[PDB]
Every structure is written in C-alpha cells, then in structure tokens.
Structure 1
C-alpha cells in the first residue's frame, strides 16, 4: 500500500528540528472530524468532506502523535472519556481505515492510559478503564506485529496484566485489613482463602465489632482509596488479584440500604461491561493473525485457558441476587446475555483453530460445560439459542474422531433437560429438534446410542418417556430451519454424512432393534441396564402411536403396516430374550449394591415383555377381524421368561424388596393367564414356576424363624395370581 505512508517524508535523505504546534491548534481536529460528514459542495466541485478526509489522512500518516496528543493528555485531567471515545469511533467509521503507525500509536497510548489509571488510584479510574476497554477491541483490529507471546511477556513484566487479558493467572492477597466506622479504632486483619465470599468477611467484621442485628443491613464494606462499594458474592481473590506485601485496606461504612444497593448495581454494571470489553478485545486479537501462526496461537490460548485456576466459574457464574432488583435487574440481564454469547463465540473460534485429531481427555468438559452454563441461564432467547446450536454443530463437524466415539455425553444432558422443561415454548422445541436432526445427519447411529445413554439416567425433575418419544418422532421426519440455524455453521451446505461408510431416515422400530443388540453384546453390564430402561420407557409409546395411526385412517394398508411393525417388534424381543440367557443364573452397603444390581435387569425384562404381550394379544383378534394368528413369542422365549422368573423367586423370600417386586408380580398375575397353556411344549415353564412356589412355601413352613419377618401380602397377591391362572384355563 503505497498510499499509506508519508511519501515526501521518506524519500528525503537522512544526514535537531523542533516542532511548535501548541495544544490549542490540536483542538481544531475535532471540528474536522465532524466536518468529515459535511456533504456541501462548492461551486467548483470540491466537497468539504473530501478535503477534510484528505487533510486528516495526511496528518495521521505523517505524525500520529502530534495530532493525537491534545486528546490523550487532556483525558487524564478530566472525566470526559465518553466524548473522546465517541470522537475516536467517529474517526474510525469515517476514515474507514487506520495505517499501521497510527493504530500502533493509538493502541500504545490507550494501554498506557489503562496502566496509569490502575497505577494511580483516582475517583473516576474504573469508569475510565471500562470506557477505554469498550473501544480497545476496535483499535486492535488494525495491528500487524501483535503476537500473543510478546504481548503476554511485556504486559506481565508490567505486572498489571489482569485488566486486559482474560487468560491471566494471579494469586490473590492472603490477608485483608479493614477499619471500622469510627476513626483510629483498632483495625482488623483477616485471612483470605481462594473461595471466600464477601458475605463471610462482612459477617465476621459485623460480629467482631459488636453491632446489633437490627442495623446489620445498614453496614457495608467499601474501598475508600479506589471508591469502590463491594458486592457480597464476589470473591476476594478476583477483586484483589495482586499478591503484594501490602494488603488492601477496606472500611466498614454506614449508609442507607437503598443508596448502597444502587451504588453496588452501578459498580457491578461497570465491571461487567469491562469484562465484556476484555472478551471483545481477545476476540479481535485472535481474529487477525497469519493463518500459519493461527494454530500455534490457538494452542497457546487453550493451554493458558486450561491452566487458569477458576475459569469455568469465571465464565459461567452470574450475580443472580441482583437480577431480581426491579430498578436495575433488566439492564444487568441484558448485558449478561451478551457476555454469555461472546463467551460462546470465543470458545467456538478457539475450537476451530485447533487440529481435528487433538487428543482430548475429560478436561474437554471444562470447555463444553461453558456452553451449557449459558443455555441454562436463559434458553428462551433466540439470539443465544441459535448461536449455541450453530457452535455445537461446528464443534461436532470439526471433531470427527472425538464426537464419533464418546463426544455427545457432555452436551445432550442439558439439552434434553431444557427440551423437557420448556414444552410450552414451541420455538425452543422446534430449534432443539432441528439441532438433534442435524446431529443425527452428522453421526447416524452412534449419535442415537449416545443420546440413549445420556437420557437413561434422567428417565422418570427428569425427562419423561413422552418427551423422548416426541423427540424421536420429530427425528423421524424433516424439520424446517425456522431460525436459520444453518447460517452460522461453517461447512458445505449439503451436510452429507461425516463417515463415508454410511441415505436413510431414522425410524423408531429401527432404533428398538438397535437397542436390543446392546443388551445382547454385554447383558451383564450397567449400559445394558440403561438400554433396558430405555426400552421399557419407549415401547408402550410406540404401541400407542401404532394404535393412534390405526385410529386416524381405516384403510387396509395401515393395517398392513401395523402387522409388519408388530412382527418386527416380536422378532426383536425374541432375539433379545434368546441373547439374554446369561441373566438366567441365580444369585452392608456392598450387599445393598449387589441386591439392586441383581434386581434391575430382570424386572425390566419382565415389565417390557408382559406389557408388550398384554397390549398386543387382545389387539390381534380385533385387528384380524377388521382385516392366521402368528405366535408372538416362541416356546423357547416363554421358557426363557419362566426361568428368569424362577431365578427371581429363588432370591424372593430372602429379601422383602424382591418379594414386593412390581415386575415379578405383574409377570406372575398378568402374563401367565393370557398365554395359551394348551400346548404341552409350553407347560414345563408353568411346571417350573409351580415347583419353585411349592419349594418356597415348604421352606417358609419348615422354620418359623423366616416366618417371623416374611411379608404375606405379596404372597397373597401371588396366590391370587395362581388361582386366577387356574380359573382362566381349567386344563
């Protein structure tokens, strides 16, 4: 760019000259800045704006400091930050560019101003720092040789580096010194750990100074030197990161509670604005670096971020107590939503910089959880919901290796919780359904398996089976991009499957067939327990959906799909029963754990099979009449269920909870009566159940010791089921 230098000031040979430009002429710059927007044209065609722009561009390229001196020095003596920052923003938005030297001088002057203000306490110090940081992120927009290592090293050497970057680690003050309301009174020195609220310090100071409880609300701690009124729930180490020999000096001041609350609101608002400014500054810094060095910069940023002691808390925690305040809560909430959005943007930008095969451990959560922290805070905001969905999709597409194996166990829990918790809001449900459909396109079956694993612990303050069924139903079809979530994703618009190995549409039945296999793979495992729970929660909803489909349309083809689906489900359950043969085997806190683990899978299997048969069996006759009954369950499957029930009875008398098992009682008194025992092949299953019942009652009768603590109402229901079976079929 030849036009970006003072041509005539560089060609001259270099073999002193003093410049006399008093400060009262530099004031003329502001009128020219205003004139840049004056469109009036002279009779000879010269426009005021063009001449002003040319003159100021030449001045800036020739000597930036001389023109931008009367403003930088003046701001120190007066609290006119707003006007000067407004003028600088107008300059930026009217010239449309800053040559390297001009932006360099401006950035150095602004950083030095921040350093001075933090250095020398003044009445309007923090406000000035906030105002300067609110604009620094634009000055950094045009700088060439700014690298993370040099900036970090130099600013740390200055040692007042915690006010510019967010990836700054500084051990805080160990002790704090505070004076009382009066003068010359015995002060107090108190310890400071790394997780101390100001509430505890206020309580200790209040009690130590013999103050009545009635006027407790009238006393607040504040820093006279910096003129700061402190919030109750802000960490000591965050406000005083400097670990110097001198501890910060506080004062316990008395004043009206309303004024104290107002001042606290103002100061927390300014501090939050400062934090937003710092985040924006880092965004701008990391959005202009040669692509070659971008990977190294992002790796360094990730390392420093990981090594920071309290980052997830810093980025997730919010001052909830102040939101309820009617006067100022709205503004704080509106500024916090922006802060959370910028944090999400920062993490997504950092993620894309790193390679696609980075070796991740569990610490990945520390980053991903941040997104969750935002989503919980306010998921009804469209601007945050669409941004979060887009960033998560970007992370999923950019991390093929991780997200294809175990990567959705961190995101899906909170998404499902919110999905279930905001049924009334159609927009949120539609957006989450679109996101889930996109994930299914991205990862196919593994995504579904990880979804089932993530939702199993929350199946019923939990996700109901109906919500999961609705989500799967939505996955069964196509969803429109109502918020245009795909606008922000960075990938080819076709969004073809990530793996070459996998054009099919998710179907519930298929999912069920997919689920049973897991149980077959490792029947004696916790994951098998989770899959069994998912099947128990899901299958009845599928049956109800089939019934509703039949109700909607009476044409025969609907019936044909119903028989086809019923046959497929019957085959799947038969395969599950055949492949779960391992569970047939029989048999203080550890004892309880063994008790429960033994219990859960067999009860789940009994519940699923009995519910399936009870719902279907009667339906078959009516549907066939509406339309050769096919055996839903083979004799071998019946034997498998009977043996499983026998194993449950084996332990039933010893433990009361097993005796009270809902699944066992349901199987005995609601599944035996319906199966047709006329075939000699199926009879041995019933003979086995009768043999165990007889042996159990003989054991009970043998010694009264067991009779003392045995519960008989379950046995009464058991005998009721037995005689009901006898009544249903006299054979």
Structure 2
C-alpha cells in the first residue's frame, strides 16, 4: 500500500533479479502475481481426539473445498441438515475458507510439510461473516499485487522494455491458473446484504486493474509477433469482464478503449483473423441488455471504430460471428427466442450505417494517433461510408467464390436472416414519409437489391448438380440441402414481398408510365427450377425434406405467381412438371415406397 509509489520511486529493477533472490525465501507468490511457484500436492486433515487421526489426502490441479466437504460428510457421517452448520479451518494461521475458490491459489508447496485442516462445529452466521471479511482482505492483497505489477512496468528503461514484457508474456503462458484466477469472482457471497456493494466495488477495481495490466502487456511487444492460438486465451479476460459488470460505466469505457488500442497495435492479426475472438461476447451482451441504452451506446461506438479501422474484413468477421447465434422462424430449424435476434443484428448494422456521437468520452484513453484513419491503403481515403446493400454485395461475393464450401452455407444463413428484415424496415421507412424522392430511392433500392439477387443466382451452378454409420450420411445430406433451401427461401420471400409492392409503389410514385420492370429474368427462373428439381430428385428416399419450408414455399407461393402467358419461361415449368410426374409415377408403381411417405 506504499510500495505502489516506492516502486515508482525506485530504479534499477528487472524481472529476473527478484525471482532469483526470492526463490531463497520460499515465498515467491506472496509478493507478485507472475511468480510461477507450484503448490501443494497433498494435504492433512486433523481430528479432535484419539477417536480420529490426521489423514493425508492427494491434491490435484482441480481440487476444491467442496470435494473435501463431501469427504468429511462421507467419512465422519455428518447429517446434511447440519451441512451449513459446520466448517473447515486451519489451526496455525486461524483462517476460514471460501467455499467456491480453489485451494491452489492459497497453499504453495511447503518444503515437505503440509498445512493442517480441521472439521469444526460453528454457528453459521459468524462463519459466513468471517468468510466475507477474510476474502475481502484476501482479494485486497490481490488488488495490491496487481497495483505492484502495473506500477512496476511503467518507468522501466526504454531498451529493456521489450525483453521484459516478452518474458512476462512467456511466464503468463506457463501459469496454469491464468486466466481462471484473473477473471473469476465469488458468487455465493454477492447476494448477501452483508457483502453487497463492498465485493462489487473491489471487484470492479480488480477487473479495471487487470484490464490496465493486460493493456500494458499487449503494448510494448513487436507488431510482427507470431500470434498463435494464445491471443484468444488472453482475450478471454476481456470477454469475462464484460460478462460480469456490463452496466458499470467504468469497465465499459476501459473495455472499449482497450480493445480499440489492441486493435490498432496488432494491425496484422486484426486485419485477417483477429476479430473472431471478441465479437461473440460483444454481440451477446449487446443482444441481452436491450433495455440499457448506455451499454448499447458504448458497443455501437466501439463497433463504429472497428469499422473505421478495418472496413471490409471486420464486416466479414462480424457476419461470421453473428451467424452461429442467429435464430429465425423456419419450419426446418425452429429458431427459439433465446439468442441474438435478427432485429438486434439489423439495428446494429443500422447504427454502423450512420454516425455515432460520443457521450461517454472513450477516445481520450486511446494511446494511438487521433483521428483514426484506415490502416491499409487497399481501401484508402475513398468514400466507403458503410451502406447496407454492400453487406449483401460482400455476402454474394463470398458465396460466389466457392458455393460448396462452409462459408457459403453460413453466409446463406446470414442472407436469409438479413434481407427480409432489410426489406421490412425499408417498407416502414417508405411507408413513413410518403414522398416522391422516397419513392425514387425505393425504386432504385429495389432495383439495386434485384441486381445483387441476379448476381447471387448467376453463380450457383455447382449446387445444381444432384447428389451422389449413418451420421456422416446425415451430415452429407444436410450440407447438400442447406444452401439450396436457403436460395429458395430468399427468392420466394423477395418475390411475394416486392412484386405487388412494385405495382403499388409504381402507382404511388407519381409516374405510372414505368410498369412491370421485370425483376427476375428467364435464366433466374430456370435456375430456381433446376435447384428445386435437384431437391425433388432426393425427396422419396429421405422423408424429412418434403416438409421443408424453402421447397414448400416455392411450390405453394412461387409457382402460381410466376407468369406463363409467354412461352420463353416455359422450360422451367416442363422440368418441374416432369419431376412431379416421375415422383408420383414412382410413388404409384412401388407400394413399399408408398408405405413410408407422408
């Protein structure tokens, strides 16, 4: 509590000298956090008389107090009505122990001695007050240790900082307790009225101190670090803090500015593969607390700065991270309302569209240069302000590069979540102001979306080829059928929404001269018919695809609205009628196949 300024006023210190001179005192972890001293491997339980003996028991790396509670409940045959009326303690130091914390942070390996343990009969309220005050004291020493480490790496010589922070990162890698002990709280004590805002305030301070320490640890190191899988483990503390105290404004401003700083520093990793470790937790926290505008404002500012730093790979990784949590009301995958909604993603993208003013003043904790510019010249100072049609253009380009891959299927799920919500909110805004330039931008926007849909259907011919101990077979039929039913769902919702609305908008445009602008062309209709025909070519052998909503919505909602008064569109219909002919001929000529059809 005074060494926090003494180490700021003492020069001549490194990482290794204190470790080399501390090992002589057998108390390395009792001063600094990064001391890698292993703990005990056995422990002794003490009795009260000659009826019982002190017994030695092994300690693993995952041992906790509850297993010892079960041990003394089973051995001494304690009734479970008196479970909370009994506690365990040490005779020498007179210390009560928290239930849900690990033994290994408390007992380092004494030289061939094991610390004692006694099963004691105590009143419960005095014991829980003792537990609360000793862990209040204990994590105040952790907070003190973190203060020592933050004040330690501030005024180091400017030649020695790189090897210091690099070997610091290396000894953080060797620790098995990181980051368990760096992010976990005490949860059986936060609900009591006698540990209400004390443990919260110190936990807020401890998390803020850990963020400061990590931010110093990330900076300093070179920008061309061989970042393996280890970054995700380090990033997990940043996720966990936002898990524990999301509405606390201090942790939010610090979290936003620290992730902005570590996205400006490691610019190589955070241009290719870096945003996949921080965005799931940010989207979950954004989706849950929708009745909390401060958390919303902080996350939209952080995501807007993410886009201003990296334009297109951030949007791609964002769509790759919002995808496995999206649930939509489909009749194949019955999406429940227990995750990221489609609206949550779309209003987040709408906040990414417009500008976000600053209310919380997060920018002055960013150590980089201001204002932020694009860190790569491939996108430069071009006016790439983020629209929403270009997100569809990116999804088209990534599904078009390889339509049999996994990113294509994933982004098809992304597209069937996004484009009904975009057409919906487009309908609200064009039914909100009712103006002639609004009609002009609605016709132009529908034309550009239609252009992107023609571009989507022009490059999926690899999906028109039909199919070729059963779990991999179900996986193969799954990855067969998902992008196809995704295309059918997208195209039939597009047609049945915007066609009559195109006639309605053409009536209310102020100019009814342009009518029947021919959204889909003949090759798109024939392509939809060949995909649906390839889907129907598997139909009688697996019984789950007859009731699929893409195919059924195409059959019952897209075939009767397709015009056939011209005969240029007709070969789509002859192939569809031919496939239904042969299916029902086969269902009629085989009674065994008829005995298993719905």
- TM interval, shorter chain, is over 0.9
Tell me the TM-score normalized by structure 2: 0.95
CA offsets 1:309-362 (integer angstroms, 9 cap, x no match): 120111111111111111113211111111011111111111111111111011
CA offsets 1:505-560 (integer angstroms, 9 cap, x no match): 10001111111111001111111111111111111111122212212222211111
Rounded to whole Å, the distance in 1 between the matches of 2:6 and 2:51 is 48
Any conservation in 2 of the 1:440–1:447 contact (CA below 8 Å)? yes
Any conservation in 1 of the 2:72–2:78 contact (CA below 8 Å)? no
For 2:369, the equivalent position in structure 1 comes to 492
Moved more, 256-265 or 548-557: 548-557
Rounded to whole Å, the distance in 2 between the matches of 1:555 and 1:171 is 73
The offset of 1:181, in angstroms, is 4.1
**3-state SS in 1 of match to 2:478:** helix
Of the three residues 213, 218, 223, the one matched with 2:90 is 223
**3-state SS in 2 of match to 1:552:** coil
**3-state SS in 2 of match to 1:323:** coil
Any conservation in 1 of the 2:42–2:56 contact (CA below 8 Å)? yes
The offset of 1:180, in angstroms, is 2.7
Q: Which has the higher contact order (CA 8 A, sep 6+)?
A: 2
Moved more, 156-165 or 335-344: 156-165
The offset of 1:212, in angstroms, is 2.4
For 2:421, the equivalent position in structure 1 comes to 541
For 2:494, the equivalent position in structure 1 comes to 612
Rounded to whole Å, the distance in 1 between the matches of 2:101 and 2:144 is 19
For 2:163, the equivalent position in structure 1 comes to 296
CA offsets 1:342-396 (integer angstroms, 9 cap, x no match): 1111111111111111110111101011100100001101100010000000000
Any conservation in 2 of the 1:174–1:243 contact (CA below 8 Å)? no
Any conservation in 2 of the 1:583–1:602 contact (CA below 8 Å)? yes
Rounded to whole Å, the distance in 1 between the matches of 2:152 and 2:559 is 72
Q: RMSD of the alignment, in Å?
A: 1.2
CA offsets 1:25-66 (integer angstroms, 9 cap, x no match): xxxxxxxxxxxxxxxxxxxxxxxxxxxxxxxxxxxxxxxxxx
The offset of 1:709, in angstroms, is 1.3
Rounded to whole Å, the distance in 2 between the matches of 1:697 and 1:414 is 50
Rounded to whole Å, the distance in 2 between the matches of 1:235 and 1:434 is 38
Any conservation in 1 of the 2:15–2:164 contact (CA below 8 Å)? yes
The offset of 1:243, in angstroms, is 4.8
For 1:325, the equivalent position in structure 2 comes to 192
Any conservation in 1 of the 2:239–2:278 contact (CA below 8 Å)? yes
Residues 161 and 624 (structure 1), Cα distance of their counterparts in 2 relative to 1, 3 Å cut: same
Q: Spell out the pairing of 1:358-507 with structure 2 (5 A cutoff).
A: 358-460=225-327, 461-502=338-379, 503-507=383-387
Rounded to whole Å, the distance in 2 between the matches of 1:243 and 1:578 is 72
Aligned length: 577
Any conservation in 2 of the 1:523–1:583 contact (CA below 8 Å)? yes
CA offsets 1:602-625 (integer angstroms, 9 cap, x no match): 111111111011111000111111
Any conservation in 1 of the 2:41–2:109 contact (CA below 8 Å)? no
Rounded to whole Å, the distance in 1 between the matches of 2:291 and 2:123 is 43
Rounded to whole Å, the distance in 2 between the matches of 1:212 and 1:495 is 65
Rounded to whole Å, the distance in 2 between the matches of 1:311 and 1:659 is 51
Any conservation in 2 of the 1:635–1:681 contact (CA below 8 Å)? yes
Instruction: Looking at secondary structure, tell me which structure has more helix per residue.
Output: 1
Rounded to whole Å, the distance in 2 between the matches of 1:684 and 1:379 is 58
Moved more, 265-274 or 175-184: 175-184
Listed as ranges, the gaps of 5+ residues in structure 2 are 328-337, 510-514
Listed as ranges, the gaps of 5+ residues in structure 1 are 1-133, 711-731
The offset of 1:689, in angstroms, is 0.9
Tell me the TM-score normalized by structure 1: 0.78
Moved more, 204-213 or 601-610: 204-213
* Structure number, greater radius of gyration: 1
Rounded to whole Å, the distance in 1 between the matches of 2:188 and 2:283 is 27
**3-state SS in 1 of match to 2:517:** coil
CA offsets 1:460-505 (integer angstroms, 9 cap, x no match): 1211110111011111111111101101001222111111222321
Any conservation in 1 of the 2:492–2:554 contact (CA below 8 Å)? yes
Rounded to whole Å, the distance in 2 between the matches of 1:191 and 1:689 is 71
The offset of 1:244, in angstroms, is 2.9
Any conservation in 2 of the 1:180–1:252 contact (CA below 8 Å)? yes
Any conservation in 1 of the 2:36–2:175 contact (CA below 8 Å)? yes
CA offsets 1:391-430 (integer angstroms, 9 cap, x no match): 0000001111000001000001000000010110111111
The offset of 1:236, in angstroms, is 2.0
Moved more, 175-184 or 353-362: 175-184
The offset of 1:182, in angstroms, is 4.0
Rounded to whole Å, the distance in 1 between the matches of 2:51 and 2:422 is 78
